[PDB]
Amino acid sequence: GPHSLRYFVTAVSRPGLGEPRYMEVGYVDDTEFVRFDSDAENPRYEPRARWMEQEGPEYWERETQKAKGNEQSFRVDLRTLLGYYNQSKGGSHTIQVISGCEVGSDGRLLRGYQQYAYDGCDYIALNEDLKTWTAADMAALITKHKWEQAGEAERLRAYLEGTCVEWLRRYLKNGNATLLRTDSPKAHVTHHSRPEDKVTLRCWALGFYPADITLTWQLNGEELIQDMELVETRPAGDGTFQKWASVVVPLGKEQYYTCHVYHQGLPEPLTLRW
Amino acid sequence: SRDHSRTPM
Amino acid sequence: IQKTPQIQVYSRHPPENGKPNILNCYVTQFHPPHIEIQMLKNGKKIPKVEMSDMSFSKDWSFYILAHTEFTPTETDTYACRVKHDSMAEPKTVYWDRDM
């Protein structure tokens, strides 16, 4: 299936409290594997996945230096955006970036992306074509023009089609035991009494990987999508995920409703009842 | 591997 | 942008008093990123708590995971206390092992 290498970057100014907080968290699919935190005791790029032990000391030195360099460019960016937006030096502001690439099952590039945001709102983003930029406002229009004269898009495209793709292939390889595994979910339903002869039925799915899963509650063959309560799939602390979906049904009518769990680790979908 | 030497904003 | 965090507390496996486990406090959909998260055992702060799985959603709001290993007992209560500018006072979400 497709695989992705994604980096979530954040720069937060802390007026009066010193230098801005700078962080980089990397992901291969749904697995955190590297991280840099400027507030760290000793700021260095560090492994977050066991399989990263295969990288030599030279890897960590290069990435750490890059991060420090990226930290500096973003300190300036924070100052700049204050000018663009005509804001005061005393406020805290944030810059967020999503950078990455995805490959098919055969390892070829499916797509690349890079998006920036200021204070929680879109700023500038590379277009699908990997050649043009799209600004969200006039301030971003200034950055767009600067980037066009500098040749940023050509430079970034080189990274997304080359480095990004090549290193993604390598990570998947060194960590295939982890990244290419499939933990099948384990499901179960719980019952909860409610006022007015009603009950809350909750269907749980635990310990699965990849994160992609489908939980549905049914009645008379039809899936009760509109009548479902549901949480976003969540990391459970050990590299696996969990999720639940609930439906409030009439007391004494519970047995009709069934829970269906769809996941790649289930050749045939799970079907449960309370 | 991360991107570097990016044009400032 | 200012968004109030959604706090979810849950364990890795169904609890069994005596069996080791992992307790999680997933704080999601918040902005700005400044936030203080504490996990508490019997009203007291747990020391060895790891923060991981940080990411943003499509709308740019933050997601962070706090987790620690623990072994459930029928008399121990666990909670997650979060503080963020969008709230008047710290919010404490308790672990409901019957959920």
mmCIF file of C-alpha atoms in Angstrom:
data_model
loop_
_atom_site.group_PDB
_atom_site.id
_atom_site.type_symbol
_atom_site.label_atom_id
_atom_site.label_comp_id
_atom_site.label_asym_id
_atom_site.label_seq_id
_atom_site.Cartn_x
_atom_site.Cartn_y
_atom_site.Cartn_z
ATOM 1 C CA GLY A 1 0.000 0.000 0.000
ATOM 2 C CA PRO A 2 1.092 3.677 -0.022
ATOM 3 C CA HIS A 3 3.503 4.922 2.619
ATOM 4 C CA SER A 4 4.356 8.401 3.819
ATOM 5 C CA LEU A 5 7.159 10.352 5.459
ATOM 6 C CA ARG A 6 5.754 13.393 7.262
ATOM 7 C CA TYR A 7 7.290 16.094 9.440
ATOM 8 C CA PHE A 8 5.179 18.287 11.730
ATOM 9 C CA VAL A 9 7.146 21.473 12.460
ATOM 10 C CA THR A 10 6.263 24.132 15.056
ATOM 11 C CA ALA A 11 7.802 27.462 16.060
ATOM 12 C CA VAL A 12 6.240 29.364 18.965
ATOM 13 C CA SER A 13 7.497 32.744 20.152
ATOM 14 C CA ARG A 14 7.557 33.290 23.918
ATOM 15 C CA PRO A 15 7.951 37.056 24.503
ATOM 16 C CA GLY A 16 9.527 37.803 27.866
ATOM 17 C CA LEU A 17 10.308 34.109 28.353
ATOM 18 C CA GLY A 18 13.318 33.994 26.041
ATOM 19 C CA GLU A 19 13.889 32.184 22.745
ATOM 20 C CA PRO A 20 11.059 30.595 20.723
ATOM 21 C CA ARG A 21 10.155 26.946 21.261
ATOM 22 C CA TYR A 22 11.087 24.872 18.188
ATOM 23 C CA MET A 23 10.048 21.275 17.536
ATOM 24 C CA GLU A 24 10.159 18.701 14.763
ATOM 25 C CA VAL A 25 8.327 15.367 14.984
ATOM 26 C CA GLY A 26 8.696 12.835 12.143
ATOM 27 C CA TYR A 27 6.388 10.009 11.034
ATOM 28 C CA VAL A 28 6.597 7.032 8.693
ATOM 29 C CA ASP A 29 2.908 6.218 8.237
ATOM 30 C CA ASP A 30 1.324 6.298 11.712
ATOM 31 C CA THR A 31 4.588 5.737 13.560
ATOM 32 C CA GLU A 32 6.560 8.492 15.277
ATOM 33 C CA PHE A 33 10.251 7.781 14.611
ATOM 34 C CA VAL A 34 12.346 10.947 15.175
ATOM 35 C CA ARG A 35 12.046 14.149 17.170
ATOM 36 C CA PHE A 36 13.796 17.426 18.006
ATOM 37 C CA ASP A 37 12.798 19.769 20.836
ATOM 38 C CA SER A 38 14.670 23.042 21.366
ATOM 39 C CA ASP A 39 13.555 23.052 25.017
ATOM 40 C CA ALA A 40 15.196 19.653 25.456
ATOM 41 C CA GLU A 41 17.853 19.224 28.145
ATOM 42 C CA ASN A 42 20.295 18.629 25.300
ATOM 43 C CA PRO A 43 18.831 19.612 21.891
ATOM 44 C CA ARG A 44 19.695 16.790 19.510
ATOM 45 C CA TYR A 45 17.643 14.862 16.965
ATOM 46 C CA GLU A 46 16.663 11.661 18.803
ATOM 47 C CA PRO A 47 15.195 8.265 17.772
ATOM 48 C CA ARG A 48 11.635 7.432 18.815
ATOM 49 C CA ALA A 49 11.434 4.033 17.143
ATOM 50 C CA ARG A 50 13.642 1.051 17.962
ATOM 51 C CA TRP A 51 14.490 0.458 14.302
ATOM 52 C CA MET A 52 16.268 3.813 14.032
ATOM 53 C CA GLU A 53 19.236 2.261 15.875
ATOM 54 C CA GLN A 54 20.447 1.179 12.429
ATOM 55 C CA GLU A 55 21.420 4.762 11.572
ATOM 56 C CA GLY A 56 25.041 5.656 12.185
ATOM 57 C CA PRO A 57 26.215 8.521 14.427
ATOM 58 C CA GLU A 58 26.676 10.565 11.265
ATOM 59 C CA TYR A 59 22.919 10.503 10.681
ATOM 60 C CA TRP A 60 22.148 12.085 14.043
ATOM 61 C CA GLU A 61 24.855 14.732 13.648
ATOM 62 C CA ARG A 62 23.565 15.830 10.233
ATOM 63 C CA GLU A 63 19.920 15.954 11.271
ATOM 64 C CA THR A 64 20.761 17.818 14.498
ATOM 65 C CA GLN A 65 22.728 20.467 12.632
ATOM 66 C CA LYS A 66 19.939 20.849 10.084
ATOM 67 C CA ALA A 67 17.345 21.273 12.845
ATOM 68 C CA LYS A 68 19.393 23.981 14.565
ATOM 69 C CA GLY A 69 19.660 25.726 11.223
ATOM 70 C CA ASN A 70 15.920 25.367 10.673
ATOM 71 C CA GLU A 71 15.374 26.685 14.193
ATOM 72 C CA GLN A 72 17.265 29.849 13.291
ATOM 73 C CA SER A 73 15.431 30.510 10.020
ATOM 74 C CA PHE A 74 12.107 30.194 11.891
ATOM 75 C CA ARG A 75 13.211 32.641 14.605
ATOM 76 C CA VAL A 76 13.557 35.208 11.840
ATOM 77 C CA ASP A 77 10.278 34.131 10.194
ATOM 78 C CA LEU A 78 8.484 34.937 13.462
ATOM 79 C CA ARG A 79 9.925 38.446 13.450
ATOM 80 C CA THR A 80 9.096 38.921 9.760
ATOM 81 C CA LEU A 81 5.441 37.896 10.068
ATOM 82 C CA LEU A 82 5.018 40.486 12.824
ATOM 83 C CA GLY A 83 5.971 43.096 10.251
ATOM 84 C CA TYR A 84 3.717 41.699 7.519
ATOM 85 C CA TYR A 85 0.754 41.673 9.872
ATOM 86 C CA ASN A 86 1.645 44.865 11.760
ATOM 87 C CA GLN A 87 1.631 43.128 15.162
ATOM 88 C CA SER A 88 3.404 43.989 18.437
ATOM 89 C CA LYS A 89 6.547 42.274 19.760
ATOM 90 C CA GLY A 90 4.836 41.246 22.988
ATOM 91 C CA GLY A 91 2.528 38.534 21.699
ATOM 92 C CA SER A 92 3.034 34.796 21.294
ATOM 93 C CA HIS A 93 2.660 33.511 17.745
ATOM 94 C CA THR A 94 2.950 30.151 16.047
ATOM 95 C CA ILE A 95 4.174 28.876 12.691
ATOM 96 C CA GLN A 96 3.238 25.319 11.696
ATOM 97 C CA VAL A 97 4.524 23.326 8.755
ATOM 98 C CA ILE A 98 3.654 19.941 7.295
ATOM 99 C CA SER A 99 6.302 18.559 4.959
ATOM 100 C CA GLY A 100 6.364 15.125 3.356
ATOM 101 C CA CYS A 101 5.991 12.679 0.462
ATOM 102 C CA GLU A 102 4.077 9.459 -0.263
ATOM 103 C CA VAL A 103 5.067 6.462 -2.371
ATOM 104 C CA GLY A 104 3.063 3.612 -3.860
ATOM 105 C CA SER A 105 3.519 -0.043 -2.935
ATOM 106 C CA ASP A 106 6.197 -0.272 -5.645
ATOM 107 C CA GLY A 107 8.102 2.657 -4.157
ATOM 108 C CA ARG A 108 7.417 5.386 -6.701
ATOM 109 C CA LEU A 109 6.319 8.898 -5.719
ATOM 110 C CA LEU A 110 2.564 9.369 -5.476
ATOM 111 C CA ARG A 111 2.693 12.989 -4.269
ATOM 112 C CA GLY A 112 4.608 15.552 -2.224
ATOM 113 C CA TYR A 113 3.385 18.393 -0.021
ATOM 114 C CA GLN A 114 4.422 21.370 2.076
ATOM 115 C CA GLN A 115 2.041 23.690 3.906
ATOM 116 C CA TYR A 116 2.640 26.618 6.255
ATOM 117 C CA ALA A 117 0.207 28.217 8.704
ATOM 118 C CA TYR A 118 0.358 31.240 10.994
ATOM 119 C CA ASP A 119 -1.587 31.282 14.259
ATOM 120 C CA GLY A 120 -3.728 28.336 13.165
ATOM 121 C CA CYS A 121 -4.647 29.684 9.742
ATOM 122 C CA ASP A 122 -3.355 28.744 6.305
ATOM 123 C CA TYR A 123 -0.560 30.908 4.993
ATOM 124 C CA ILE A 124 1.059 29.413 1.906
ATOM 125 C CA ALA A 125 1.076 25.947 0.371
ATOM 126 C CA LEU A 126 2.827 24.196 -2.483
ATOM 127 C CA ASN A 127 0.299 23.186 -5.128
ATOM 128 C CA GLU A 128 -0.157 19.581 -6.254
ATOM 129 C CA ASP A 129 1.902 20.411 -9.351
ATOM 130 C CA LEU A 130 4.956 20.897 -7.129
ATOM 131 C CA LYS A 131 5.697 24.032 -9.146
ATOM 132 C CA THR A 132 3.339 26.746 -7.929
ATOM 133 C CA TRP A 133 2.390 28.329 -4.593
ATOM 134 C CA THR A 134 -1.014 29.396 -3.322
ATOM 135 C CA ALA A 135 -1.287 32.189 -0.734
ATOM 136 C CA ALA A 136 -4.116 32.465 1.781
ATOM 137 C CA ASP A 137 -3.806 36.231 2.247
ATOM 138 C CA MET A 138 -1.896 39.342 1.205
ATOM 139 C CA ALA A 139 0.927 38.860 3.725
ATOM 140 C CA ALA A 140 1.530 35.399 2.242
ATOM 141 C CA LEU A 141 1.500 37.093 -1.173
ATOM 142 C CA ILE A 142 4.778 38.779 -0.216
ATOM 143 C CA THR A 143 6.374 35.432 0.721
ATOM 144 C CA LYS A 144 5.018 33.913 -2.515
ATOM 145 C CA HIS A 145 6.760 36.548 -4.649
ATOM 146 C CA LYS A 146 10.041 36.184 -2.664
ATOM 147 C CA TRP A 147 9.913 32.405 -3.075
ATOM 148 C CA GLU A 148 9.248 32.700 -6.805
ATOM 149 C CA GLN A 149 12.284 34.930 -7.374
ATOM 150 C CA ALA A 150 14.475 32.743 -5.161
ATOM 151 C CA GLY A 151 13.455 29.536 -6.921
ATOM 152 C CA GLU A 152 12.184 27.829 -3.784
ATOM 153 C CA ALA A 153 9.671 25.559 -5.568
ATOM 154 C CA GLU A 154 12.352 24.033 -7.827
ATOM 155 C CA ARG A 155 14.522 23.499 -4.742
ATOM 156 C CA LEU A 156 11.724 21.931 -2.705
ATOM 157 C CA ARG A 157 10.611 19.717 -5.610
ATOM 158 C CA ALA A 158 14.142 18.298 -5.679
ATOM 159 C CA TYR A 159 13.781 17.345 -2.015
ATOM 160 C CA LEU A 160 10.287 15.843 -2.330
ATOM 161 C CA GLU A 161 11.052 13.760 -5.405
ATOM 162 C CA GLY A 162 14.539 12.726 -4.346
ATOM 163 C CA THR A 163 15.709 12.820 -0.734
ATOM 164 C CA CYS A 164 12.247 12.385 0.717
ATOM 165 C CA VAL A 165 11.446 9.411 -1.530
ATOM 166 C CA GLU A 166 14.831 7.722 -1.122
ATOM 167 C CA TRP A 167 14.929 8.025 2.676
ATOM 168 C CA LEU A 168 11.307 6.851 2.919
ATOM 169 C CA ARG A 169 12.288 3.685 1.018
ATOM 170 C CA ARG A 170 15.199 3.202 3.396
ATOM 171 C CA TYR A 171 13.141 3.695 6.570
ATOM 172 C CA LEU A 172 10.508 1.209 5.424
ATOM 173 C CA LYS A 173 13.315 -1.257 4.830
ATOM 174 C CA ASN A 174 15.205 -0.925 8.109
ATOM 175 C CA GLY A 175 11.930 -0.869 10.006
ATOM 176 C CA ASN A 176 9.834 -3.258 7.909
ATOM 177 C CA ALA A 177 9.227 -5.533 10.896
ATOM 178 C CA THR A 178 7.456 -2.672 12.615
ATOM 179 C CA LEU A 179 6.146 -0.551 9.737
ATOM 180 C CA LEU A 180 4.877 -3.451 7.611
ATOM 181 C CA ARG A 181 3.168 -5.406 10.405
ATOM 182 C CA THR A 182 -0.585 -5.744 10.890
ATOM 183 C CA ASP A 183 -1.979 -6.004 14.418
ATOM 184 C CA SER A 184 -5.568 -7.268 14.233
ATOM 185 C CA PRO A 185 -8.030 -5.458 16.487
ATOM 186 C CA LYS A 186 -9.791 -7.080 19.426
ATOM 187 C CA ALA A 187 -13.311 -5.790 19.924
ATOM 188 C CA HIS A 188 -15.962 -5.799 22.661
ATOM 189 C CA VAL A 189 -19.188 -4.007 23.578
ATOM 190 C CA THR A 190 -20.157 -2.432 26.906
ATOM 191 C CA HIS A 191 -23.658 -1.622 28.195
ATOM 192 C CA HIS A 192 -24.711 1.552 30.022
ATOM 193 C CA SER A 193 -28.162 2.303 31.430
ATOM 194 C CA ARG A 194 -29.806 5.647 30.643
ATOM 195 C CA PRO A 195 -32.972 7.440 31.768
ATOM 196 C CA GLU A 196 -36.190 6.783 29.821
ATOM 197 C CA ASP A 197 -35.586 3.052 29.249
ATOM 198 C CA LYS A 198 -32.608 3.591 26.944
ATOM 199 C CA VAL A 199 -29.084 2.187 26.955
ATOM 200 C CA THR A 200 -25.748 3.251 25.550
ATOM 201 C CA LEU A 201 -24.009 0.486 23.632
ATOM 202 C CA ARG A 202 -20.339 1.155 22.982
ATOM 203 C CA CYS A 203 -18.215 -0.897 20.625
ATOM 204 C CA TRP A 204 -14.479 -0.940 21.312
ATOM 205 C CA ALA A 205 -11.644 -1.904 18.967
ATOM 206 C CA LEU A 206 -8.188 -2.243 20.608
ATOM 207 C CA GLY A 207 -4.543 -2.912 19.847
ATOM 208 C CA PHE A 208 -4.592 -2.550 16.085
ATOM 209 C CA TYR A 209 -2.165 -1.314 13.439
ATOM 210 C CA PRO A 210 -2.343 0.310 10.888
ATOM 211 C CA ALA A 211 -4.556 3.054 12.319
ATOM 212 C CA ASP A 212 -7.065 2.701 9.474
ATOM 213 C CA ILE A 213 -10.223 0.950 10.635
ATOM 214 C CA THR A 214 -13.998 1.052 10.182
ATOM 215 C CA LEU A 215 -16.484 0.677 13.032
ATOM 216 C CA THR A 216 -20.203 0.576 12.248
ATOM 217 C CA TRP A 217 -23.368 -0.248 14.168
ATOM 218 C CA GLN A 218 -26.202 -1.886 12.238
ATOM 219 C CA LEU A 219 -29.929 -2.578 12.501
ATOM 220 C CA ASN A 220 -32.028 -4.523 9.970
ATOM 221 C CA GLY A 221 -29.013 -4.658 7.669
ATOM 222 C CA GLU A 222 -28.639 -0.879 7.468
ATOM 223 C CA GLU A 223 -25.638 0.921 8.977
ATOM 224 C CA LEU A 224 -26.780 3.565 11.505
ATOM 225 C CA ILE A 225 -24.145 6.169 10.584
ATOM 226 C CA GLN A 226 -26.231 9.230 11.541
ATOM 227 C CA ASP A 227 -27.156 7.720 14.914
ATOM 228 C CA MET A 228 -23.593 6.959 15.999
ATOM 229 C CA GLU A 229 -21.312 8.538 18.588
ATOM 230 C CA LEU A 230 -17.645 8.109 17.693
ATOM 231 C CA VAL A 231 -14.105 9.154 18.676
ATOM 232 C CA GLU A 232 -11.171 9.783 16.389
ATOM 233 C CA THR A 233 -8.788 6.805 16.255
ATOM 234 C CA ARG A 234 -6.204 7.244 18.980
ATOM 235 C CA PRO A 235 -2.638 6.059 19.801
ATOM 236 C CA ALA A 236 -2.618 3.814 22.858
ATOM 237 C CA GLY A 237 0.995 4.308 23.941
ATOM 238 C CA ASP A 238 2.722 1.267 22.422
ATOM 239 C CA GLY A 239 2.466 1.900 18.690
ATOM 240 C CA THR A 240 -1.056 0.507 18.412
ATOM 241 C CA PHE A 241 -4.388 2.330 18.237
ATOM 242 C CA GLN A 242 -7.939 2.080 19.568
ATOM 243 C CA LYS A 243 -11.397 3.433 18.776
ATOM 244 C CA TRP A 244 -15.017 3.194 19.887
ATOM 245 C CA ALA A 245 -18.450 3.900 18.452
ATOM 246 C CA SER A 246 -21.711 4.005 20.374
ATOM 247 C CA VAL A 247 -25.441 4.007 19.779
ATOM 248 C CA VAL A 248 -28.318 4.618 22.221
ATOM 249 C CA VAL A 249 -30.980 1.936 21.763
ATOM 250 C CA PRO A 250 -34.376 1.016 23.317
ATOM 251 C CA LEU A 251 -34.134 -1.142 26.447
ATOM 252 C CA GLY A 252 -34.870 -4.762 25.597
ATOM 253 C CA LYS A 253 -34.103 -4.179 21.908
ATOM 254 C CA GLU A 254 -30.297 -4.309 22.228
ATOM 255 C CA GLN A 255 -29.805 -7.792 20.697
ATOM 256 C CA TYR A 256 -30.847 -6.565 17.242
ATOM 257 C CA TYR A 257 -27.920 -4.150 16.918
ATOM 258 C CA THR A 258 -24.564 -5.527 15.773
ATOM 259 C CA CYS A 259 -21.083 -3.997 15.600
ATOM 260 C CA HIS A 260 -18.920 -4.523 12.524
ATOM 261 C CA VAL A 261 -15.170 -4.025 12.557
ATOM 262 C CA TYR A 262 -13.233 -3.681 9.284
ATOM 263 C CA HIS A 263 -9.428 -3.729 9.247
ATOM 264 C CA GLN A 264 -6.721 -5.194 6.998
ATOM 265 C CA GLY A 265 -5.773 -7.684 9.719
ATOM 266 C CA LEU A 266 -9.280 -9.155 9.585
ATOM 267 C CA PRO A 267 -9.707 -11.303 6.437
ATOM 268 C CA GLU A 268 -13.384 -11.303 7.355
ATOM 269 C CA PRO A 269 -14.985 -8.464 9.394
ATOM 270 C CA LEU A 270 -15.834 -8.910 13.077
ATOM 271 C CA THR A 271 -19.491 -8.879 14.126
ATOM 272 C CA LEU A 272 -20.478 -8.329 17.750
ATOM 273 C CA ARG A 273 -23.563 -8.012 19.933
ATOM 274 C CA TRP A 274 -23.897 -7.257 23.636
ATOM 275 C CA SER B 1 15.601 13.115 6.479
ATOM 276 C CA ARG B 2 14.424 16.724 6.889
ATOM 277 C CA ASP B 3 14.522 19.694 4.503
ATOM 278 C CA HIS B 4 17.101 22.463 5.042
ATOM 279 C CA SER B 5 18.460 25.744 3.617
ATOM 280 C CA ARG B 6 14.896 26.938 3.047
ATOM 281 C CA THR B 7 14.142 30.410 1.711
ATOM 282 C CA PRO B 8 12.925 32.617 4.567
ATOM 283 C CA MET B 9 9.374 33.962 4.542
ATOM 284 C CA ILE C 1 -6.662 30.910 17.042
ATOM 285 C CA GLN C 2 -8.026 29.740 20.398
ATOM 286 C CA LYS C 3 -9.493 26.245 20.689
ATOM 287 C CA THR C 4 -10.468 24.364 23.837
ATOM 288 C CA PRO C 5 -8.812 20.912 24.148
ATOM 289 C CA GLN C 6 -10.735 17.642 24.162
ATOM 290 C CA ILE C 7 -9.278 15.357 26.854
ATOM 291 C CA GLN C 8 -9.627 11.582 26.591
ATOM 292 C CA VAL C 9 -8.376 9.229 29.314
ATOM 293 C CA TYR C 10 -8.069 5.492 28.609
ATOM 294 C CA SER C 11 -5.892 2.421 29.130
ATOM 295 C CA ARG C 12 -4.143 0.194 26.558
ATOM 296 C CA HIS C 13 -5.886 -3.028 27.646
ATOM 297 C CA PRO C 14 -9.080 -3.678 29.579
ATOM 298 C CA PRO C 15 -7.980 -3.243 33.207
ATOM 299 C CA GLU C 16 -7.396 -6.271 35.419
ATOM 300 C CA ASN C 17 -6.390 -5.373 38.949
ATOM 301 C CA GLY C 18 -2.795 -6.480 39.295
ATOM 302 C CA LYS C 19 -1.977 -6.695 35.583
ATOM 303 C CA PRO C 20 0.485 -4.028 34.320
ATOM 304 C CA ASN C 21 -0.901 -1.542 31.774
ATOM 305 C CA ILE C 22 -0.492 1.904 30.152
ATOM 306 C CA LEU C 23 -2.696 4.879 30.968
ATOM 307 C CA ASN C 24 -3.209 7.512 28.279
ATOM 308 C CA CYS C 25 -4.388 11.065 28.263
ATOM 309 C CA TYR C 26 -4.931 12.236 24.708
ATOM 310 C CA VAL C 27 -5.357 16.005 24.527
ATOM 311 C CA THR C 28 -6.705 17.044 21.144
ATOM 312 C CA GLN C 29 -7.958 19.950 19.039
ATOM 313 C CA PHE C 30 -6.341 22.859 20.867
ATOM 314 C CA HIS C 31 -4.639 26.151 19.985
ATOM 315 C CA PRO C 32 -2.293 27.856 20.944
ATOM 316 C CA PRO C 33 0.211 25.031 21.661
ATOM 317 C CA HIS C 34 1.003 26.261 25.183
ATOM 318 C CA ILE C 35 -0.491 23.674 27.555
ATOM 319 C CA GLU C 36 0.251 21.920 30.854
ATOM 320 C CA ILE C 37 -0.766 18.271 31.226
ATOM 321 C CA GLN C 38 -0.514 16.239 34.431
ATOM 322 C CA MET C 39 -1.505 12.658 35.141
ATOM 323 C CA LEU C 40 -2.506 11.963 38.734
ATOM 324 C CA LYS C 41 -2.681 8.850 40.863
ATOM 325 C CA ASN C 42 -4.843 9.387 43.943
ATOM 326 C CA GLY C 43 -4.671 13.151 43.562
ATOM 327 C CA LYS C 44 -0.900 13.057 43.384
ATOM 328 C CA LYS C 45 1.233 13.827 40.335
ATOM 329 C CA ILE C 46 2.749 10.869 38.453
ATOM 330 C CA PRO C 47 6.504 11.391 37.646
ATOM 331 C CA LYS C 48 7.354 9.084 34.733
ATOM 332 C CA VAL C 49 4.905 10.386 32.132
ATOM 333 C CA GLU C 50 5.940 10.296 28.476
ATOM 334 C CA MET C 51 4.582 12.811 25.936
ATOM 335 C CA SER C 52 4.358 11.503 22.375
ATOM 336 C CA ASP C 53 2.369 11.392 19.132
ATOM 337 C CA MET C 54 2.259 15.126 18.552
ATOM 338 C CA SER C 55 0.603 16.161 15.289
ATOM 339 C CA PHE C 56 -1.826 18.733 13.873
ATOM 340 C CA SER C 57 -5.114 18.072 12.123
ATOM 341 C CA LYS C 58 -6.285 19.597 8.834
ATOM 342 C CA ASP C 59 -7.537 22.726 10.608
ATOM 343 C CA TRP C 60 -4.120 23.020 12.309
ATOM 344 C CA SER C 61 -5.253 22.263 15.855
ATOM 345 C CA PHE C 62 -2.822 20.342 18.097
ATOM 346 C CA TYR C 63 -2.903 16.719 19.270
ATOM 347 C CA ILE C 64 -0.584 15.389 22.011
ATOM 348 C CA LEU C 65 -0.420 12.110 23.972
ATOM 349 C CA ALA C 66 0.634 11.763 27.586
ATOM 350 C CA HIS C 67 1.135 8.230 28.839
ATOM 351 C CA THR C 68 2.606 6.302 31.731
ATOM 352 C CA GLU C 69 2.670 2.635 32.743
ATOM 353 C CA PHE C 70 0.563 1.629 35.708
ATOM 354 C CA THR C 71 -0.999 -1.458 37.288
ATOM 355 C CA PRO C 72 -4.699 -0.948 38.143
ATOM 356 C CA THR C 73 -6.027 -1.667 41.628
ATOM 357 C CA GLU C 74 -9.652 -1.472 42.723
ATOM 358 C CA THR C 75 -8.843 1.415 45.097
ATOM 359 C CA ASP C 76 -6.608 3.657 42.943
ATOM 360 C CA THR C 77 -8.094 6.582 41.028
ATOM 361 C CA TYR C 78 -6.427 8.117 37.983
ATOM 362 C CA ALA C 79 -7.074 11.464 36.328
ATOM 363 C CA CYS C 80 -5.592 13.889 33.828
ATOM 364 C CA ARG C 81 -5.444 17.577 34.660
ATOM 365 C CA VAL C 82 -5.008 20.017 31.777
ATOM 366 C CA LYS C 83 -4.460 23.786 31.871
ATOM 367 C CA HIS C 84 -4.815 25.962 28.752
ATOM 368 C CA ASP C 85 -5.596 29.662 28.106
ATOM 369 C CA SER C 86 -9.033 28.774 26.737
ATOM 370 C CA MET C 87 -10.164 27.607 30.163
ATOM 371 C CA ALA C 88 -10.930 29.528 33.366
ATOM 372 C CA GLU C 89 -9.602 26.765 35.639
ATOM 373 C CA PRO C 90 -7.707 23.455 35.139
ATOM 374 C CA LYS C 91 -9.813 20.630 33.771
ATOM 375 C CA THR C 92 -9.494 17.206 35.403
ATOM 376 C CA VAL C 93 -10.765 14.190 33.467
ATOM 377 C CA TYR C 94 -10.984 10.919 35.419
ATOM 378 C CA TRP C 95 -10.338 7.430 34.165
ATOM 379 C CA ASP C 96 -13.684 5.626 33.881
ATOM 380 C CA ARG C 97 -12.721 1.958 33.847
ATOM 381 C CA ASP C 98 -16.342 0.954 33.218
ATOM 382 C CA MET C 99 -16.624 2.886 29.910
#
